Ligand binder design. Sequence first.
Ligand SMILES: NC(=O)[C@H]1CCCN(C(=O)CN2CCOc3ccc(Cl)cc32)C1
Ligand SMILES: [Zn+2]
Length: 139
Amino acid sequence: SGAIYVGNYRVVNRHLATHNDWANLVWEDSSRDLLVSSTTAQGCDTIARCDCQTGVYYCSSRRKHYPVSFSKPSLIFVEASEYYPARYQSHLMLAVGHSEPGDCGGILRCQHGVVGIVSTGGNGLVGFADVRDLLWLDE
Ligand SMILES: NC(=O)[C@H]1CCCN(C(=O)CN2CCOc3ccc(Cl)cc32)C1
Ligand SMILES: [Zn+2]
């Protein structure tokens, strides 16, 4: 569990979206595991507009923040699950670090702000769904 709150938007993992998220839907992408829904309250999360590859992510399974080196956003194969079949997830960054199933939604941050949220993991790795290309979140 975890979300990004920027202005009049709420960015969540598409597989964890609730009924209100789909009733106030702005944009969703199964291949990115993202869903953005509208909000009545004014959010203040600063989105990073950068090309960073180092930052800090929040790990609910260890109740700790961790500094990571991560890859540039790309098409990475993800095994089938109870939310999606076997596909290539796009805009996904990988890093060496602890992650377990309840960790989806933990924020990844750099000096410039929010980079993305935990989406995949396993075998001593962590995957983040990037949000830095979505310039409409700010405008
Ligand atoms: N992006 C996706 O398709 C997600 C949707 C459901 C969750 N996904 C998983 O990988 C589930 N899982 C299995 C392997 O061990 C893990 C360790 C950490 C995390 Cl965050 C998830 C998992 C794929
Ligand atoms: Zn940055």
